[PDB]
Design a protein around this ligand. Structure first.
Ligand SMILES: Cc1cc2nc3c(=O)[nH]c(=O)nc-3n(C[C@H](O)[C@H](O)[C@H](O)COP(=O)(O)O)c2cc1C
Ligand SMILES: Cc1cc2nc3c(=O)[nH]c(=O)nc-3n(C[C@H](O)[C@H](O)[C@H](O)COP(=O)(O)O)c2cc1C
Lengths: 404, 404
């Protein structure tokens, strides 16, 4: 069912806010949203071009791309997600960042590393293992599945870690800059690699990257400091989901509480800002939400309020913000401080002009969870056409080709 | 000026709540409140007898005594505060816990260790140093003052620490049990010893009691675990002031944020509770307040809300709860969860029958900050008489004698 909504045009959501060196004209953001419409070889496609161009028509909007791989070792998905380690990649993404820029908008890229939840069948085809902070499995099934193909998860060595910072991520930060990205965002949420490293249930390392709160955070901060000196702090973002239990993160039930784990981290980030090295934004994930799925009113067990008392800079919040629609009481409270942005993912998928719709209170077209993760244009770029010209076949046949 | 207030009789504040093995009949608590009306040799007096008896007339009230010394080394004050290390002490406190008990009320004792803020002139007269986690001074004055008498603050050795746990505090937990106390509360706030140990601005130790978040907390937790096995978890309380800057604690401006420092600690305490070793209550200090003095609306920079999302047991809050009087909107919100108690200190000083006054909305007699810390009965037990029989002289002459 469609969602009736009131206008946000006169709210703080259309007041300008400086994020790094760029000024957005709306505080409404498209957060990183995986869609598996990249080409086979992990390169951006003619579909992604239209799909990102489509959503940048409100001048000065900030778009954040789907999780993108930093390297072959960082992948692990059965679907076609994009990468940004080769020149092939970058030059293609370039065509897209140009498109968004020509519309006065901005675009940040989320850098992801799967780690302990990589599909062992696929890593095998790259002559790779599944890796992680320690050698753990999401589920009991995910561990057997891995062994069956003879490709168990192995823990990175103190050396392979350093190479992530100075070879793996560095290369991608640079291909990103070559690609035209206005920011890059370290995906430190949803129980992927960096989240794996941050929290005790997935990180029982004995070296300097494990063993204490400080150690566990050690790696994330090394990427921040080093990448700050390659792209500049003003182009670095990070995402966190303190409360999510996606891919089996213990969250509030771990041996160290997320408040403890993430205040430490956030407050370290603030100290850097104090010395003039503040990153652009901290992207957090509201407790209503966990990964790509809602959390029920009864299981929410915290908030991200602590982030606001510790970090003085820009915050990006997302997660089912139309729950108290059509008035948006909650969203308006969250943006009251005038340094907070608000993310709309799923409703962005089916509302290419979402920023416009929210501005003028136009009813939100519902989203097709069925076509989130499929491999064709059906349920992807269709929402931009007039519904009565959509040819469900022709469009299901339409897979990602190449650009130009 | 007097404070007009509405009745709390029908609120959750007069619903029974189980705290350890005792059930209170009111949630309104007298928090630890230093008054310096003990005898010269740190033994309880005929004045303290009347003063604590006076406030226990509502059956099932919980009273918490003024900070009490655990040993000669733990003192450091120019005024006459009580101790609980000798038998002399205990037998005297006994006369008092009996009095409160005969009134169906309960009484916990706050165990304090001054540390780095001991007056070096007085420690000298015991042939002692000022001690601490590290060798630091509150102020630049407090360091010079100390040297002038040739008694600088020295850092405890790894050994002296162990002795606090197994000799210093153990002895006092036992003299406490001998004394009739229903609980004992570890004073881990206001920048005294345990707070000194918990936080980085006062703890740069290189052993196991410093160097990490975990290490810094190590000592507090060792006292919890060990004292749990001597008095039982159900008789242990701890107080924290996450945000106070009393005696120069950096609070939100330290190298580790209080949220980080105290979530860790509180969540460790919860894990013990999960194994059946939960202490009786966590006493926190609301950001409106810092030590014995108010904090202005502009400098409050956090809340203790994180404590409630982490600890599942009884919480005791205090700190200027009549700010939104006469309705008490805030107090009623804070007790809504039905496991929270509310502390009234200063208004308890001049309202011996405070519990009764709050129950029936009777106007609160104002307090005399001038006579908080003086050495006679004037401004102490006077508030229990009819004001027009008070003889300001006779009562200023009246100093602490002995009991019976
Ligand atoms: C299909 C789908 C793909 C997603 N992909 C990502 C992703 O790659 N990275 C990420 O950080 N979050 C991802 N999310 C989570 C969203 O960014 C966001 O946290 C969540 O949708 C809450 O906002 P919303 O309810 O307004 O979409 C995804 C969510 C969905 C539904
Ligand atoms: C004179 C005086 C003495 C105090 N002594 C202590 C003490 O020994 N230990 C302690 O933890 N807090 C002490 N406090 C702080 C109070 O317990 C409490 O945190 C503060 O008064 C806020 O509550 P109130 O404003 O209702 O009194 C003292 C406060 C005052 C005014």
């Amino acid at each position: 069912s469609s969602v009736k909504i009131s206008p946000l045009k006169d709210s703080e959501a259309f007041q300008s806010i400086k994020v790094g060196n760029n000024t957005l004209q709306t505080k409404i953001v498209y957060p990183p949203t995986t869609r598996f419409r990249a080409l086979e070889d992990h390169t951006p496609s003619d579909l992604q071009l239209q799909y990102y161009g489509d959503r940048s028509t409100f001048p000065g909007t900030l778009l954040i791309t789907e999780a993108t791989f930093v390297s072959p070792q960082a992948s692990g998905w059965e679907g076609a997600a994009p990468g940004i380690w080769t020149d092939k990649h970058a030059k293609a993404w370039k065509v897209i960042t140009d498109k968004v820029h020509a519309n006065g908008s901005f675009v940040s890229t989320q850098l992801i590393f799967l780690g302990r939840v990589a599909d062992p069948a696929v890593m095998k085809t790259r002559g790779l293992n599944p890796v992680s902070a320690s050698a753990t499995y999401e589920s009991d099934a995910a561990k057997e599945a891995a062994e069956a193909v003879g490709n168990p998860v192995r823990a990175l060595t103190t050396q392979e870690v350093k190479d992530l910072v100075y070879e793996a991520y560095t290369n991608a930060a640079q291909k990103a800059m070559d690609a035209g990205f206005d920011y890059i965002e370290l995906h430190a949420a949803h129980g992927y690699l960096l989240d794996q490293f941050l929290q005790p249930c997935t990180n029982q390392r004995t070296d300097e990257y494990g063993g204490s709160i400080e150690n566990r955070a050690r790696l994330i901060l090394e990427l921040i400091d080093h990448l700050s000196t390659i792209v500049g702090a003003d182009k670095i973002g990070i995402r966190i989901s303190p409360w999510a239990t996606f891919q089996n993160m213990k969250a509030h039930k771990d041996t160290v509480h997320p408040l403890t784990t993430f205040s430490y981290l956030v407050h370290e980030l603030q100290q850097r800002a104090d010395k003039g090295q503040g990153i652009a934004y901290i992207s957090v994930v509201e407790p209503r939400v966990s990964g790509n799925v809602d959390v029920s009113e009864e299981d929410q067990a915290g908030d991200n309020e602590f982030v606001s008392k510790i970090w003085k800079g820009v915050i990006l919040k997302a997660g089912n913000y139309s729950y108290d629609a059509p008035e948006f009481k909650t969203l308006k409270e969250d943006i009251a401080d005038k340094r907070t942005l608000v993310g709309f993912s799923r409703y962005f998928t089916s509302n290419p002009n979402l920023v416009w719709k929210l501005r003028d209170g136009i009813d939100l077209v519902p989203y097709d969870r069925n076509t989130f993760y499929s491999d064709n244009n059906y349920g992807y770029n269709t929402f931009s056409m007039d519904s009565e010209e959509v040819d469900k076949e022709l469009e299901i046949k339409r897979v990602p080709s190449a650009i130009e």
